[PDB]
From a paper:
The most prominent such domain has been identified by bioinformatics as part of non-structural protein 3 (Nsp3) of the virus and appropriately named the “SARS-unique domain” (SUD). SUDcore turns out to consist of two subdomains, SUD-N (Nsp3 residues 389–517) and SUD-M (525–652), each exhibiting the fold of a macrodomain. The two subdomains are connected by a flexible linker (residues 518–524) and a disulfide bond. Instead, we have demonstrated that full-length SUD and SUDcore bind oligodeoxynucleotides and oligoribonucleotides that form G-quadruplexes.
In this communication, we describe the crystal structures at 2.2 Å and 2.8 Å resolution (monoclinic and triclinic form, respectively) of the core of the SARS-unique domain (SUDcore, Nsp3 residues 389–652). Two crystal forms were observed under identical crystallization conditions: Form-1 crystals were monoclinic (space group P21, two SUDcore molecules per asymmetric unit) and diffracted X-rays to 2.2 Å resolution; form-2 crystals were triclinic (space group P1, four SUDcore molecules per asymmetric unit) and diffracted to 2.8 Å. Both structures were determined by molecular replacement. The r.m.s. deviations (on Cα atoms) between the models derived from the two different crystal structures are around 0.7 Å. In both crystal forms, SUDcore displays the same head-to-tail dimer, with the SUD-N subdomain of monomer A interacting with the SUD-M subdomain of monomer B, and vice versa. Due to the two-domain architecture of each monomer, the resulting four lobes give the dimer a quasi-tetrahedral shape. As to be expected, the structures of the monomers are very similar to one another, with r.m.s.d. values (for Cα atoms) of 0.58 Å between monomers A and B of the monoclinic crystal form, and 0.11–0.37 Å between monomers A–D of the triclinic form. In all six independent copies of the SUDcore monomer, residue Val611 adopts forbidden conformational angles. The side chain makes a hydrophobic contact across the subdomain interface and is also contacting the side chain of Phe406 of a symmetry-related SUDcore dimer in the crystal lattice in the monoclinic crystal form (this also applies to two of the four monomers in the triclinic form). One potential binding site for G-quadruplexes might be in a cleft between two consecutive SUDcore dimers as they occur in both the monoclinic and triclinic crystal forms, but for confirmation, any of these models will have to await crystallographic determination of the complex.
Author numbering:
A (entry chain D): 389 to 395, 405 to 516, 524 to 652
B (entry chain A): 389 to 516, 524 to 652
The structure:
């Protein structure tokens, strides 16, 4: 049951979430204040629902929605945590993972009491491919482009003739980043955050991966590398910014 | 909207052909048709589908009466809303189809039913072993495996089981995959997806002696592990805990998803 939502002094015990390997979730990693996280790697790998405790720090291995995990599966792993008062984050965030509404219900269904901590408008433009390519060639920024979009690929081969289209980085006029509709959105986002370069992209997964503007905006939240996100119409700018700011 | 469900009474495939001849098949990103949709085929030319591969989710391909749609994968993160949206990309007509996205970690029968019911198109839906279910413990299963020479899928991340294995089969080098040492073992992790393990076992097509893959180890309860076990095509002896669980597991296996 969600006792309160923060909008730490005073109450003790924290509830952190980790994966099978033992790596903590992004939201739960930020909750740390330089504590000894050696106890978590000492018993790795874990099964879904495994509870690890070291004093006040309590960790639970939760199922991954992007890996097929269900709401019922998450709620069941949360029931394995010993009933107490905890300061936590929302479990399973965020690209292709559990939504804020799904995570809220999971915590509310649990017998334990929770104090839940919460999880750019300027970067949202309305540029077409021609406009974006001009920006990319001058700024020397990386341009994430879906290889499986024939219409876009044609424009690229016509403007940048002699290009050898291959997966990943292709520096030929524009520093392109070619991704497939085969490769998961969370996998592409992980690859771009690792590179930590300035970007000029469209909402990753929109159309190409079966996402509508709302869904692609939720995955874009997990993008940490500075980016210029381009949407179709100028009317879509405010919409995309609405889906980005609001709840999952 | 699901107009009717084929049951042999009082709606047959031959009977429904008067209403429509158009079929709705489902495929993945690569262009490979789903298991349920592959069985619907009667020796038709499926070359048109590989001619424009790879596809994006929601891509509609038509060759006369045969209509194909690339649907999202639930095991790959796909949602109910995403499937319903890809189905809305199909041109509104009367179709003979199967349930989309079956079955290991994919969409349930209840979720697929709603997706078709939400769509503007009318559908004539075709439907998607008790003998293999035993109640043996590890000691019992290992004896069966060493004599029958069958493959034994074992979760590496279960310390209790690993201890028993190293004690009975001393000098064993536990590694991922096939380890033939007394028993032809198949070591899998809780890291590797259930649908990925099942795909690996169907490919090997060997006789098996296993527990319901994913149960406990992957966060599944008996009901959920039974749904994934449906997709196991390689001959297997599925062992459950108690003899009281045998009928339960067989119940979850026979019934709807």
């Amino acid at each position: 049951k969600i006792k309160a939502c923060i909008d730490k002094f005073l109450t003790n015990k924290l509830l952190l979430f980790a994966d099978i390997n033992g790596k903590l979730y992004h939201d739960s990693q930020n909750m740390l204040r330089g504590e000894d996280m050696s106890f978590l790697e000492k018993d790795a790998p874990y099964m879904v629902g495994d509870v690890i405790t070291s004093g006040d720090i309590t960790c639970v291995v939760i199922p991954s929605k992007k890996a097929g995990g269900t709401t019922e599966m998450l709620s069941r792993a949360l029931k394995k945590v010993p009933v107490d008062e905890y300061i936590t984050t929302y479990p399973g965030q965020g690209c292709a993972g559990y939504t804020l509404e799904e995570a809220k219900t999971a915590l509310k269904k649990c017998k334990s009491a929770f104090y839940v901590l919460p999880s750019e408008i300027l970067g949202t433009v309305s540029w077409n491919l021609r406009e974006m390519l001009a920006h990319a060639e001058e700024t020397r920024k990386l341009m994430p482009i879906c290889m499986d979009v024939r219409a876009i690929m044609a424009t690229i081969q016509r403007k940048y003739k002699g290009i050898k289209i291959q997966e990943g980085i292709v520096d030929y006029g524009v520093r392109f980043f070619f991704y497939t509709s085969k490769e998961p959105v969370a996998s592409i986002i992980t690859k771009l955050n690792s590179l930590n370069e300035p970007l000029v992209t469209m909402p990753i997964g929109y159309v190409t991966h079966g996402f509508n503007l709302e869904e692609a905006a939720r995955c874009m939240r997990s993008l940490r590398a500075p980016a210029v996100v381009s949407v179709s119409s100028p009317d879509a700018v405010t919409t995309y910014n609405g889906y980005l700011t609001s709840s999952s």
